[PDB]
Design a protein around this ligand. Sequence first.
Ligand code: INS
Length: 296
Amino acid sequence: GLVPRGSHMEVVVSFNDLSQPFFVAMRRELEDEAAKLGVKVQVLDAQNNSSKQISDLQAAAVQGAKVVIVAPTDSKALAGAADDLVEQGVAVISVDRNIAGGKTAVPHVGADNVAGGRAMADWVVKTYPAGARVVVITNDPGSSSSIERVKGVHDGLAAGGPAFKIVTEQTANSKRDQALTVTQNILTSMRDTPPDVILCLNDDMAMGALEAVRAAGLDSAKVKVIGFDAIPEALARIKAGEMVATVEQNPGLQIRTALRQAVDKIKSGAALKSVSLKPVLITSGNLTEASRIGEM
Ligand SMILES: O[C@H]1[C@H](O)[C@@H](O)[C@H](O)[C@@H](O)[C@H]1O
């Protein structure tokens, strides 16, 4: 869906799946920053298809793109395309999740997702000092963000010990509809001993898990749901006392930082560099620390 370049002040931005609310919101911040920087952004949606994303990236290079910002559908699967683009003289920077396993080290702007996952688990260990039964519902399984969030959750619960039980860990592929049915089936499988905490690795899925908890006739005070992203819908649930926590990862700042680096690469050849942002756990006491609180 590319059009011809009119100047050098153009960047191609390839999103993994623009049907995800987190990324729709990220795209809005991208468009603001692009206007402010005087750069045209051409936005491509991979529609959760690695083959399409790879062909999109190849096409952008053929048509003259010199910097591409990519949120890869799968962090390992896009390594070949990134290497090819670099070899052709196209600079690549990743956003939100990384590209890994290739010849070239691709600079990456994202959240510290291990720290984010660890914050969720540390919350569980602090809140349940005698132990707890935990369900983990994971995001986009091929993404570094899922892999690293999961690792941080594992780290914190392993540190807590055998009293902190991961009763099941399943993906809902960053989809609210899958989150509902996946969570329902998990609840049914342990209806005689419901979990204490459902850790959901994005807020869209957390909304589905909250609904599954309600559909099961369970009490959101006894079966607690924690998300990730601090989207306004989740912030409202925390304000209402239905959801306990989420995690702020500053997606506006991620995308703005990637674009700022891209523009400096175009203007002066400045090197693209990795930046990891520290996430912050958001509860009812610090809702205003969420970057999108003004939308709630
Ligand atoms: O950081 C993002 C965010 O959490 C999205 O909501 C999720 O679906 C993606 O998988 C993740 O990489």
